[PDB]
Amino acid sequence: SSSRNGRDSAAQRLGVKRFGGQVVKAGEILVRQRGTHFHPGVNVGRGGDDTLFALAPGAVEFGAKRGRKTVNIVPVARP
Amino acid sequence: YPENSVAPSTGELALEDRASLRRVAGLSTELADVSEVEYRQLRLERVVLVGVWTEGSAADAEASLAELAALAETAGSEVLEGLIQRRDKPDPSTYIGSGKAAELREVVLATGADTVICDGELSPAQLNALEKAVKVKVIDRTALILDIFAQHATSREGKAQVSLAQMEYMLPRLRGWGESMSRQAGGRAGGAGGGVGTRGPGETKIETDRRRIRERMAKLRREIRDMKKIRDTQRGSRRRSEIPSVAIVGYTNAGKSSLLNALTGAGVLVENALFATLEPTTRRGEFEDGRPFVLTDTVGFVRHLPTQLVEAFRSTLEEVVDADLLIHVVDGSDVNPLAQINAVRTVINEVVAEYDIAPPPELLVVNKIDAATGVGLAQLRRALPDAVFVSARTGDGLDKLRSRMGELVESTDATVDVTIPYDRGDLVARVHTDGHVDATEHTDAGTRIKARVPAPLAATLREYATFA
RNA sequence: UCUGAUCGUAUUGGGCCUCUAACCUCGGACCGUAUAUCCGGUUCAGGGACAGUGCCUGGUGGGUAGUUUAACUGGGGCGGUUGCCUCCUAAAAUGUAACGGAGGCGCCCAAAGGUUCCCUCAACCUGGACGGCAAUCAGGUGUUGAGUGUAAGUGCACAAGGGAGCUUGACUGCGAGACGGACAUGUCGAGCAGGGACGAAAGUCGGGACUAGUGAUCCGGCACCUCUGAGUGGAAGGGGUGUCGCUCAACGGAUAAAAGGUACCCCGGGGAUAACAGGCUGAUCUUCCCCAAGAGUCCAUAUCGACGGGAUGGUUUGGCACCUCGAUGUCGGCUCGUCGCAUCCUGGGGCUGGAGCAGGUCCCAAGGGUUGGGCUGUUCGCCCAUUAAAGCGGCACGCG
RNA sequence: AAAACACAGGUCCGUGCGAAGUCGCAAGACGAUGUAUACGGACUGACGCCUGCCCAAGGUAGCGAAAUUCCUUGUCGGGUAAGUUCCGACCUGCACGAAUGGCGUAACGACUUCUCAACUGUCUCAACCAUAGACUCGGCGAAAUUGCACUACGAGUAAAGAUGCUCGUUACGCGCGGCAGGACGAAAAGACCCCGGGACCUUCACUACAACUUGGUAUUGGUGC
RNA sequence: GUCAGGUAGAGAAUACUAAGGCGUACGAGUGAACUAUGGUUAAGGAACUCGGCAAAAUGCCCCCGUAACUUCGGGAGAAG
RNA sequence: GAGUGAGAAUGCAGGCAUGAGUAGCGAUUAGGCAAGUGAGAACCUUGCCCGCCGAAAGACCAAGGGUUCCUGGGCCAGGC
RNA sequence: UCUACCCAUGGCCAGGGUGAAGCGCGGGUAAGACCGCGUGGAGGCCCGAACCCACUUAGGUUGAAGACUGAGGGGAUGAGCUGUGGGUAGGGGUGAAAGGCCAAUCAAACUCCGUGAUAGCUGGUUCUCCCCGAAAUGCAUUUAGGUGCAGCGUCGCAUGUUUCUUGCCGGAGGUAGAGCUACUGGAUGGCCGAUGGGCCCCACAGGGUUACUGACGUCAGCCAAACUCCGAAUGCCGGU
RNA sequence: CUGCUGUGAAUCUGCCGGGACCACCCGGUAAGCCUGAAUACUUCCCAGUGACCGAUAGCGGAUUAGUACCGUGAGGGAAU
RNA sequence: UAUAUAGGCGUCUGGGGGGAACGCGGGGAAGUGAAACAUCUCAGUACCCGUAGGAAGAGAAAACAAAAUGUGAUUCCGUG
Ligand SMILES: Nc1nc2c(ncn2[C@@H]2O[C@H](COP(=O)(O)OP(=O)(O)CP(=O)(O)O)[C@@H](O)[C@H]2O)c(=O)[nH]1
């Protein structure tokens, strides 16, 4: 009475790695995603696998534009 | 062990005139009403039949397939085609002739098929030999006979006795095809249900484990033991009253239930099928002048009565052996009504052999008058022996069936003249209401008459019986 | 010696026939010898460069030996899996088991890659020769329902979908800083230089819309290098760079190389794990009930009562694996019991399709009783002859 | 303790003779002080029975029967009140199986399974009698077992079967002779099942070796083609 | 391994005895159940039981008479 | 500086409990009395009687044992 | 020295039956074969003690005894039983073959040695007080009752509130719920309606039609882990 | 550097080694011998030593000790 | 059988067996470790055979070394 099922895949730890208002260094990953759940705005770039990474030191921000959630890096002012 | 293997090469199995790979496969069977055999989904199994020509000829040759096609349709699956062979010798392996296994596999693959039938009980191996070759669900005459009763089952009595018959038919072939059926199971719904066939109970299967099968046969046998007591308790009043009873004995589809509806105003079910009425049902009726007698139907009797299913017909057999006058209904469809009647009558012989009381008086009738004898004319009405028939395939009038039935029923009621005086204000009322009032030669005052009376009224008026 | 047949003489191998001196004979006769079927010696008779033995070498070889013969597993076997990818389970961060529910992968593409530029489908409506429901064409409606090489999902109409021009970035030398993480693995990466592609430039290009398409180390192969070079110069070998060889698929990969029997078994352990027994559940089973379609001669409920529904008992078949494997001895029979009543007889009642004789069903009732035999291991059941009856069950399927 | 081994009988195979075979590294030994009417191995296991036209090339050529029992195929009766083993006439068309395996077989058997006659305490169904223990008295005088102790019962609870816990019931202290229902009684670190290790056995598992066999070369030479 | 009395017997079986040697090493009681070993059992006669297990029964000598089958030997002590 | 700390290993050596003054006291033959001996007598000595074996349980030979044979003395171990 | 078989040399088997060959006589005959009678005394012959073995049953079963006793049993002139003396020795022997026996053990005897074999297995591990104080999870495993690394303990060292709770603020989510005329499915009853059929004219073209069907669509009510136009509460990530 | 089986050299411009091999250099001069000291061990004997045991320890053996005793034998083997 | 030898006769000198360890030469395991196992390790240990000596074995470069004007038999210790 064998079972045809039983297989699965590994833990691709997707999800947002830096949330709103979080201070980031350049190059850091912001979301690991499959597809285009999020888009890039200002100072945000897309990697090979639809990853989103910072392009300047700053603070993360999540907004929307034209109907698609986008991630931006607002430049923190030096106090 | 393997000798010259050129048998279907040059040799002929039983080719006296027409055999040995001939597989006439004539009479493609099948029938269409308004098309839409299913109307949404797989409501037909596209079955195929089989027949083995034996003693007899065209008189019966096609008769088997004619009966089987109708029976399979009743089960509710389109019969694609039939296939027989002259078959001088019934081969115990598959009794099919020259073992044309590849040939029948190919002619069933050429057709949608996916279901096959047979004629007669098949031994476990006697059917496996074809299961292997065909690679399709195969169920023989007795399997379908039982499935019909299962589908039509209505009450506890039937749902138990048909269940027992099915278990005991499995008993000799618990190995092989039963496991083959269970392997893929019904698969939503199978071609052979269980205790009730038409969905509902019996949805799972018939035989799955030998232990459970034996257990359930034991329980079922005890249940029928219980039902015998219940039935004989119910059947008290008639035997306690000595009330004449008659039985409608018809082969099948002979309009027994419809005839009962007629002549008695009964409203019993009359469905198009070879096994419609499940248990013998009865009703009180009146003869020409009175005699509040009883009339009962019988359950269908098909050629080669499967002995694997007798618990169902046991009640019917009892109800026919505990009766006086028998009326034999036939169906005017086949070409050999003589064969129909002789076959169905072959059973009363063993009935009386077992429960010997006497050969009951006999009468004949054949329904379907409107549609029957379309090319028969009144030969069967004049030249043929005792028979009366006016019922139509839906219903008609009854003219002398109710007269000769009374004249041939037990005439135990004494007809000796008795003298009834005036005496009380309405003393004659007792006789008027009891013993009929035949020949009410009412005169005057102390009215003098002549009428029949039963044993107690005769003995009560004995002293007053002054000759005319 | 260069372009080169045949030459004269001397050095040699094989096949075949022989010979005797190597060697062989448990064939004979003599001597050591008085005894000796030993042994050696002389000689005669047969073989004979064979055979046998030494070193080397290819086959046959359980005759014998050393061993291997995986794990998961609602006990074990049998069956079925074993790595990677996607979804649900998965409880709105990540993650999360089950022999839980579905599927794919062990590739493909020299363009289906890079870049520049342009376009918008499916479906529907109306009209048109073949041509139709569906081909190509015209108009309109048509914001995503078509398609996206390949599983599913995340996305894609800003197009990642559809066309075309040119190209090879399917680069070399790197890499701030991060994700994931037992470790080893695994993913992302702006930007700098060299030399290119596309484009007027800005710019994009370190393979494919993303996520599977793979295998550590060892050992060895193949090309190049300002390496090394066992006294010295070389070379052999080694080293670096780049790459190559594993259904090592049991996919973190014991060996380069491996199946089975044991009731002839044995040892170390285990109630971590089974068979009997107890325990929980009650699917199955037994005891009934609820509703009443129908049957029962008319008449649901004298007697039954389908399709459906609710439970009791813990005796059957099972599920679980909680005690017991440093021992709880299995069935049937015999002896001895004791108990429940769901009563077989005897006792008291109701109803009756109870005239009487009897019967059916229900209620109360456990005091006592409930046979002997033939076959059947038979769990058990069939038969014989009686009786008022030859009851059903629990107690480690009571009691070794 | 037998149906098993053996056995006389039979049929193959090896062996031409310090044979073949076996023990031994070898010498050597047995086989044999024997010689194919013998020796060694291998199966079977007295004795009898098993069937014709083709069968310097005639053709399908497998007999095509039997003494055939899987043959509960009710396919009937005898065996008795009810009878298992069986006994006989039927369904028993590849059935089946046997050219070397099957049928028969007188005699025999502490073999297996049944029926009859006689006989009986085997039984219905038990009673009595004697002896040897038991029992009492005198002498000597162990043993296994043993966490403990002035060690009840019911219903419960608990590692789910309670002398030992809870709540109730019952029971004056101490012995003697008996029964065997408990102490999951004693006995043997369960022989069953699983796990790990082992052993021995099998083989077309792996890898070796003994042994056998094939060739090169040394022993090993001469003359002729 | 050797000797082998007498009677009844075929007998070296069995019984009782001669010669010879022993009473061999815990006893004395006691009608307990129960166990072992013997004995007997009315009437039935395998009903017991998985199974005639055990026990019972026949058993010697002399005269008659001895079947089916058979390898012609037997069977055979047939059996009676 | 340690052979340094035991209540368990079905641990090992010695001593001693419980069962318990309990089972058993070893074949299918059998002993009794009188008298003696002696502190002490069922068991020893003598006399009688009774019983057992008698193809041995009698009498020899070999193997094996090794002084167990006989006389005197003794009786705390052994003799169930 | 037991036991398996073999070798050398001895011994033993009470008593009683049947009666084969051979030989003689007589018949049968050419003829023998064959038939009766006599001596004769063969036989893995018969009955049965000694002797040997071990079929049944009871007893014993901390036994009288580590294999016996009682009572019946089988062989008992033969492949017989037995004494004395020898031979075959372990991966070897012997085996009328049971894996039987080889000194109370044999699917490879005994003793000593290698040796204090090894055992992922079971048992054992001895005096006290104080402080702290777990895990039964993840991954991998010829792996699952073992082990390595991480997690969770303790101790020393370094920093020091970075820990944690509460408030407020900034975040992504697609669960609970809910919704479907917003997607993919199934489905409940109506409404209109192509296919229509069958019917009235009758063409077949052209008009009505027709207990009826559902193409599309419409109304009302539904539901879904692998449906979502939406969508909380907690949790989580930072800041304060 | 060596053991077995084949084959098989030159005597100094000779021959071997210098980590495959080749040339130059360098070191030696095979196929012949003998040779103490430095070094390993205690059957035995003599003189001492011990943050060694002290009668269940220390040798199995403080007393009959390889004794009694067990086994056919090798062999095991105490207590006081 | 002729030379001669084998062999025979006599006479002289030696060996033979034992011993705790250590020496030299030669055969040479497996348990075990590798978490299995075969190479491998165990380990040239155990055991065995031959053979002595008070010690043995090896010993006088056909050696090392590396261009150093090198050291100068063997043995055994300590480093490396
Ligand atoms: N011949 C006949 N047929 C009839 C009559 N009335 C009806 N029928 C048709 O016959 C069919 C079968 O019903 P019927 O023959 O009465 O069944 P039955 O023979 O009484 C009982 P069963 O069907 O089991 O044999 C029905 O479908 C019905 O339409 C009649 O009077 N005579």
| Torsions phi, psi for B300 (to 5 deg) | -60, 140
AA letter at B150: A
Q: What whole-number distance in Å separates Cα of residue B59 and Cα of residue A55?
A: 98
Helix B210-234 with B311-321: angle, nearest 10 deg: 20
Candidates B398, B397, B438, B396; CA nearest to B414 is B438
- Distance in angstroms, CA of B69 to C1' of G194? 39
Q: How many CB atoms lie within 10 A of CB B94?
A: 23
CB B145 within 8 A of CB B96: no
**For ligand 1, atom 9: residue with the closest CA:** B393
Between residue 14 and residue 43 of chain A, the positions with Cβ below 7 Å from nucleic chain C are: 14-17, 25-29, 32-37
Structure-block tokens of residue B90: 């019934």
CB B250 within 8 A of CB B330: yes
Candidates B76, B72, B80; CA nearest to B109 is B80
b/e sequence B160-180, b meaning 16+ C-beta within 10 Å: bbbbbbbbbbbeebbeebbee
| Nucleotides of strand G under 7 angstroms from a protein beta carbon | 169-173, 236-239
Q: What whole-number distance in Å separates Cα of residue B217 and Cα of residue B197?
A: 18
Residue B45 CA to its chain's centroid (Å): 25
Exposed, middle or buried: residue B102 (CB in 10 Å: 0-12, 13-18, 19+)?
exposed
CB B372 within 8 A of CB B366: yes
B261 annotated as a binding-site residue: no
Q: Find the largest Cα–Cα distance for chain B.
A: 104
Classify B350 in phi/psi space as left (phi over 0), alpha (psi -120 to 50) or beta.
alpha
Q: Find the largest Cα–Cα distance for chain A.
A: 69
* Bridge pairing between strands B293-296 and B282-285: antiparallel
Q: Position of tokens 């020949």?
A: B439
CB B117 within 8 A of CB B147: no
Q: What whole-number distance in Å separates Cα of residue B52 and Cα of residue B16?
A: 15
Exposed, middle or buried: residue B58 (CB in 10 Å: 0-12, 13-18, 19+)?
exposed
* Bridge pairing between strands A15-16 and A68-74: unpaired
CB B298 within 8 A of CB B328: no
Q: Output DSSP code: residue B48.
A: B
Structure-block tokens of residue B310: 């007798």
Classify B21 in phi/psi space as left (phi over 0), alpha (psi -120 to 50) or beta.
left
| Centre of ligand 1 from the C-alpha of residue B275, in Å | 10
- Distance in angstroms, CA of B436 to C1' of H34? 164
Structure-block tokens of residue B17: 């005139």
| Centre of ligand 1 from the C-alpha of residue B144, in Å | 21
Which H or E run contains B320? Answer: helix B311-321
Q: What whole-number distance in Å separates Cα of residue B284 and Cα of residue B245?
A: 9
Which nucleotide, over all strands, has the C1' atom closest to the CA of A14? C94
CB B50 within 8 A of CB B62: no
DSSP E strand boundaries for B278-392: 282-285, 293-296, 325-331, 362-367
DSSP E strand boundaries for B55-157: none
Q: Output DSSP code: residue B462.
A: G
Which residues, at least 6 apart from A8, have a Cβ–Cβ distance to it below 8 Å?
none
Candidates B130, B126, B20, B39; CA nearest to B78 is B39
SS (H, E, C) B185-248: CCCCCCCCCCCCCCCCCCCCCCCCCHHHHHHHHHHHHHHHHHHHHHHHHHCCHHHHHCCCEEEE
Query: Alpha-carbon Rg of chain A, whole angstroms?
Result: 16
Instruction: Give the resolution to one decimal, in Å.
Output: 3.1
Residue B251 CA to its chain's centroid (Å): 5
| Centre of ligand 1 from the C-alpha of residue A54, in Å | 87
Candidates B224, B405, B267; CA nearest to B323 is B405
- Distance in angstroms, CA of B399 to C1' of H71? 121
CA dihedral of residues B145, B151, B155, B160 (deg, nearest 10): 50
Query: Alpha-carbon Rg of chain B, whole angstroms?
Result: 27
Classify B294 in phi/psi space as left (phi over 0), alpha (psi -120 to 50) or beta.
beta
- Distance in angstroms, CA of B92 to C1' of F63? 84
Candidates B59, B112, B61; CA nearest to B83 is B61
Which H or E run contains B455? Answer: helix B455-461
AA letter at B5: S
Between residue 156 and residue 175 of chain B, the positions with Cβ below 7 Å from nucleic chain C are: 156-157, 159
Candidates B122, B76, B145, B74; CA nearest to B302 is B145
Taking the alpha carbons at both ends of chain A, their separation in whole angstroms is: 69
Q: Output DSSP code: residue B463.
A: G
Which residues, at least 6 apart from B455, have a Cβ–Cβ distance to it below 8 Å?
B414
Method: cryo-EM
**Three-state secondary structure call for residue A74:** strand
| Nucleotides of strand D under 7 angstroms from a protein beta carbon | 60-63, 94-95
**Three-state secondary structure call for residue B341:** helix
Taking the alpha carbons at both ends of chain B, their separation in whole angstroms is: 96
Q: How many CB atoms lie within 10 A of CB B289?
A: 12
- Distance in angstroms, CA of B338 to C1' of C24? 110
- Cα angle for residues B214, B220, B222 (degrees, 5° grid): 110
The ligand 1 atom nearest the CA atom of B276 = 24
Alpha helices in B386-441, H assignment, sequence order: 401-408, 428-433
SS (H, E, C) A15-55: EECCCCCCEECCCCEEEECCCCCCEECCCEEECCCCCEEEC
AA letter at B40: R
Q: Output DSSP code: residue B103.
A: H
CB A38 within 8 A of CB A69: yes
Instruction: Count Cα neighbours of B239 within 13 Å in the Cβ-side half-sphere.
Output: 10
Candidates B328, B336, B299; CA nearest to B388 is B328
CB B7 within 8 A of CB B21: no
| Centre of ligand 1 from the C-alpha of residue B250, in Å | 10
Q: Which of B257, B270, B329, B333 to mutate to test the pocket of ligand 1 (most atoms within 8 A of CB)?
A: B270
Q: Output DSSP code: residue A75.
A: P
Q: Is the dihedral of CA B107, B109, B112, B113 positive or negative?
A: positive
Helix B156-170 with B311-321: angle, nearest 10 deg: 120
Q: What whole-number distance in Å separates Cα of residue B374 and Cα of residue B293?
A: 35
| Centre of ligand 1 from the C-alpha of residue B269, in Å | 9
